Amino acid sequence: RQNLQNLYINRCLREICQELKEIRAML
Amino acid sequence: QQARQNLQNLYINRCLREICQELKEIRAML
Amino acid sequence: RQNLQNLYINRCLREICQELKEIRAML
Amino acid sequence: QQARQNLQNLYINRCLREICQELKEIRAML
Structure with missing residues (x-):
């Protein structure tokens, strides 16, 4: 359980x- | 550029x- | 335990x- | 501005x- x-x-x-890795790439 | x-x-x-x-939901579940 | x-x-x-709330403010 | x-x-x-x-550490501990 x-x-x-x-x-x-x-x-x-x-x-x-x-998702945070994709955000870092955008940055 | 700016917009x-x-x-x-x-x-x-x-x-x-x-x-x-999502992290608040995890906190509640823990 | x-x-x-x-x-x-x-x-x-x-x-x-x-920390993410502070980052959002910067944004 | 740009720099x-x-x-x-x-x-x-x-x-x-x-x-x-930090989240990777939490994952390992769970």
């Missing part, structure tokens, strides 16, 4: 990291 | 706002 | 949120 | 890099 939630949190964090 | 620059500034601001919202 | 780690993760997330 | 703009761009890039590093 906890492990499940963490998996969804970690996917979101990875997606945010990819 | 494109100002638009890009507003666009990145909106992206960062969305990211902040 | 888990609760402890989450507290330190949540403080970091709150700090990041404050 | 200040370019510097600010590089400064924000560096901040976002640091934030990415």
Whole structure:
């Protein structure tokens, strides 16, 4: 249960990291 | 140049706002 | 233990949120 | 104006890099 939630949190964090990398490229 | 620059500034601001919202959601879940 | 780690993760997330708010102001 | 703009761009890039590093650390810990 906890492990499940963490998996969804970690996917979101990875997606945010990819978005911030794209933002840095724009900059 | 400047209107494109100002638009890009507003666009990145909106992206960062969305990211902040997501991090607030994660905080609540933790 | 888990609760402890989450507290330190949540403080970091709150700090990041404050930093991103300052970045948005600069923008 | 433009050199200040370019510097600010590089400064924000560096901040976002640091934030990415922190989120990677959180991911590892979760």
